[PDB]
Scaffold this active site. Sequence first.
Site, PDB file in Angstrom:
ATOM      1  N   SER A 176       0.834  -1.196   0.000  1.00 34.49           N
ATOM      2  CA  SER A 176       0.000   0.000   0.000  1.00 34.49           C
ATOM      3  C   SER A 176       0.872   1.249   0.000  1.00 34.49           C
ATOM      4  O   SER A 176       1.839   1.349   0.761  1.00 34.49           O
ATOM      5  CB  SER A 176      -0.926   0.002   1.214  1.00 34.49           C
ATOM      6  OG  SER A 176      -0.187   0.110   2.419  1.00 34.49           O
ATOM      7  N   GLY A 177       0.518   2.209  -0.852  1.00 32.17           N
ATOM      8  CA  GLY A 177       1.280   3.436  -0.973  1.00 32.17           C
ATOM      9  C   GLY A 177       2.706   3.199  -1.423  1.00 32.17           C
ATOM     10  O   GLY A 177       3.650   3.709  -0.812  1.00 32.17           O
ATOM     11  N   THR A 181      -0.304   3.386  -8.362  1.00 32.02           N
ATOM     12  CA  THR A 181      -1.202   4.277  -9.086  1.00 32.02           C
ATOM     13  C   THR A 181      -0.431   5.279  -9.934  1.00 32.02           C
ATOM     14  O   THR A 181      -0.783   5.516 -11.096  1.00 32.02           O
ATOM     15  CB  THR A 181      -2.118   5.001  -8.103  1.00 32.02           C
ATOM     16  OG1 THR A 181      -2.843   4.040  -7.328  1.00 32.02           O
ATOM     17  CG2 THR A 181      -3.102   5.889  -8.847  1.00 32.02           C
ATOM     18  N   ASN A 223      -1.404   5.768   3.206  1.00 28.78           N
ATOM     19  CA  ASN A 223      -1.327   6.484   1.937  1.00 28.78           C
ATOM     20  C   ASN A 223      -2.406   7.554   1.904  1.00 28.78           C
ATOM     21  O   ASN A 223      -3.575   7.263   2.169  1.00 28.78           O
ATOM     22  CB  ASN A 223      -1.491   5.502   0.769  1.00 28.78           C
ATOM     23  CG  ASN A 223      -1.444   6.179  -0.584  1.00 28.78           C
ATOM     24  OD1 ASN A 223      -1.320   7.399  -0.681  1.00 28.78           O
ATOM     25  ND2 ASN A 223      -1.545   5.383  -1.642  1.00 28.78           N
ATOM     26  N   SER A 226      -4.940   6.820  -1.682  1.00 31.27           N
ATOM     27  CA  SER A 226      -5.037   5.369  -1.679  1.00 31.27           C
ATOM     28  C   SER A 226      -6.195   4.943  -2.564  1.00 31.27           C
ATOM     29  O   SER A 226      -7.312   5.445  -2.408  1.00 31.27           O
ATOM     30  CB  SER A 226      -5.240   4.839  -0.258  1.00 31.27           C
ATOM     31  OG  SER A 226      -5.418   3.433  -0.260  1.00 31.27           O
ATOM     32  N   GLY A 447      -3.678  -2.211  -2.765  1.00 29.28           N
ATOM     33  CA  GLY A 447      -2.504  -2.987  -2.444  1.00 29.28           C
ATOM     34  C   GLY A 447      -2.542  -3.597  -1.062  1.00 29.28           C
ATOM     35  O   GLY A 447      -3.278  -3.157  -0.181  1.00 29.28           O
ATOM     36  N   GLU A 449      -2.218  -4.470   2.571  1.00 33.13           N
ATOM     37  CA  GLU A 449      -2.208  -3.514   3.666  1.00 33.13           C
ATOM     38  C   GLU A 449      -2.639  -4.223   4.940  1.00 33.13           C
ATOM     39  O   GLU A 449      -3.381  -5.208   4.899  1.00 33.13           O
ATOM     40  CB  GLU A 449      -3.134  -2.329   3.366  1.00 33.13           C
ATOM     41  CG  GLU A 449      -4.612  -2.701   3.315  1.00 33.13           C
ATOM     42  CD  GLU A 449      -5.457  -1.681   2.567  1.00 33.13           C
ATOM     43  OE1 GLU A 449      -4.883  -0.803   1.889  1.00 33.13           O
ATOM     44  OE2 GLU A 449      -6.701  -1.752   2.665  1.00 33.13           O
TER      45      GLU A 449
HETATM   46 MG   LIG Z   1      -3.445   3.252  -5.821  1.00 30.91          MG
END
Ligand SMILES: [Mg+2]
Length: 748
Positions: A176-177, A181, A223, A226, A447, A449
């Site tokens: 995550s983060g 993206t 994030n 997110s 993602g 997490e």
């Molecule tokens: Mg993303």
Amino acid sequence: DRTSDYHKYLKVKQGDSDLFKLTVSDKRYIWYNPDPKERDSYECGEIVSETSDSFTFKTVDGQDRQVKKDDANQRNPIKFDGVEDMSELSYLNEPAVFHNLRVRYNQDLIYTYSGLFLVAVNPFKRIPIYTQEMVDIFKGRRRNEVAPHIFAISDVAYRSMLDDRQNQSLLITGESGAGKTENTKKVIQYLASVAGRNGVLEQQILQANPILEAFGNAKTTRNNNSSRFGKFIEIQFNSAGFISGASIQSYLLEKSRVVFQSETERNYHIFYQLLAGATAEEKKALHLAGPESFNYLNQSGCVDIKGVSDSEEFKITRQAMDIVGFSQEEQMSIFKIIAGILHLGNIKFEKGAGEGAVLKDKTALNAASTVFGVNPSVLEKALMEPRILAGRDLVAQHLNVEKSSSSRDALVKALYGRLFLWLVKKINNVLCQERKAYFIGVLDISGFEIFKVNSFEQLCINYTNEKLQQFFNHHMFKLEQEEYLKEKINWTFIDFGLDSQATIDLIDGRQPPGILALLDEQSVFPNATDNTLITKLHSHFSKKNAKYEEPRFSKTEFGVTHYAGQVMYEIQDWLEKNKDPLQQDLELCFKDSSDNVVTKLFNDPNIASRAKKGANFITVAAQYKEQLASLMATLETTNPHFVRCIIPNNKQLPAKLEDKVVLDQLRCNGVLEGIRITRKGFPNRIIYADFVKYYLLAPNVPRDAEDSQKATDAVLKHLNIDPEQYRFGITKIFFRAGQLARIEEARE
Ligand SMILES: [Mg+2]
Ligand SMILES: Cc1ccc2[nH]c3c(O)cc(Br)c(Br)c3c2c1
């Protein structure tokens, strides 16, 4: 040269002249652990002496430690520090592979090939390496001609699509983060500019993400931007080779972040962009107020993101809606729904007489009814006295406070879930110009997490991230060696020890029943409670599956050992969440609304009508598993290209690269393993016939080369390329890492 904008930010600085004095040193160093209790904090020691099978080195403190050659982690000669493709390293191990990333990352070099996939360490600073001049550089240039860059692998995919005439896909994985993206947007930026016009369609495709990011992203503790949803973006291509259209598939919208947000988190951006940045006419038209005055936005304790201007972002969101073609009214209807959703959360039910809920204050109810264009009294009765079929009779359920306030949320989540579904449908309608010939998929997903309170949404996310990882394993490790043996190339199978199909089975296994399979059974079970569900999980495979743990410390939780660690999921109210129930009088109250969109939401069968599974409606888990598996099959149709994104630390800070954090990601992503198979194996493979495509230096290349085996061997024979470096098999010639790169460069 070095003055170029590209040498400044994409290539390693030329080292000192004093560094040369060290780069030629005959010394041999070794990575070691000054504290064996921390197997990720290494230090550089110099090998002093060696026995037949041991090393003696002086620690930084001077103390002499001793280690076996087998367990030793030698340091590569510093001439490799900064190398772009990490398969070129001699001493290949976790310490060394991590050091090469410190070197590059410290020069704002976030991209580093390692085998055929790409590594991307999140910089958390705007690095100017995505300008137009960059896109122009990689247009046509071969992967070997340019440095590591997301544009490069996006071109390799594009060229592989045209050369081989095969569909492609860029699979981007990460925590995550971690930069999933952002890299996708850059991948779309590249492809659009390279295969566009000289454009409208290209401009439109770019403007889709800002829309989705407005309604689909939010601020988690991990994030601030997110993706609470997963997307697969196909870039349709024409028979000639230019972009002809596009299509977006969406998955797992975290639609309860609307009615609830964890401490310090934030609701979806779209709500704050409205309140801050809405016109004074819309503000009073929609009965708007400050974030702190709404029960769905004032609970998190955070309404503002660092360095983000929701007022300015609100501009951007509607700039993009104009470009794709959302009507002046369609947009106003959307904001109308957002306001209505905000008002709904402020409804305060209370025990009037005890039998059921009573709504004394109706200022919030009517403010929500006014926007949605629904009779406030029909809504009031459908929220608190909905009707049901008792046998064949008709009975009104005098819901209480806790049961009325939930049906409220069930509506809220339903509206936005469908609203979101409508947006994508309105976007695909303008981008799916035609069913095209070729297509390049781009996979941006929510993602892996781990939060303090893990829930169903987290399981489905991690289940996705897990399923994605095994896919990386199948094509890099399992399928790669099967090709070798499939061509009778005298290969010995290698078990890299990377396999999570067990954890997958635990979750989605049908027979034996996986976790999701039991939830479906318990869900339909009428008397099924959370007590019965959690007990039906422990009793089932508590001490029967090593990827599962019944904790001594909680009666409402269970642990699953994912590829990235163990996650302790909370089971509270999963039954209702998998049913996704929406009371039926509510569905009627809005089916008769006076607003175009709201009408299309509850009357369009594609959005409102949930599929049926024989006797009962399809469940969420059952639905998503069908959605994901459908996506995975689509991926197997295409040649993938992996981008492993890595987050340097757990504080969202730049230039702060934590060793312990990064290694856990590399270690579990198979990055290190992923290079060995590239290094010890034969990555490049091409049919023997397709290799003649004839260099006029002692040329003996007949296009119609009978006995292609001898035809190509003669070329390799004259080329004087190490035969060990290219073992060849039955139907195609295989080349070791980079052996073909040095061969094809002769033409250029
Ligand atoms: Mg993303
Ligand atoms: C679309 C969907 C389906 C099932 C879900 N289960 C959830 C949960 O347990 C917590 C949160 Br927050 C959300 Br959103 C969901 C969810 C969303």
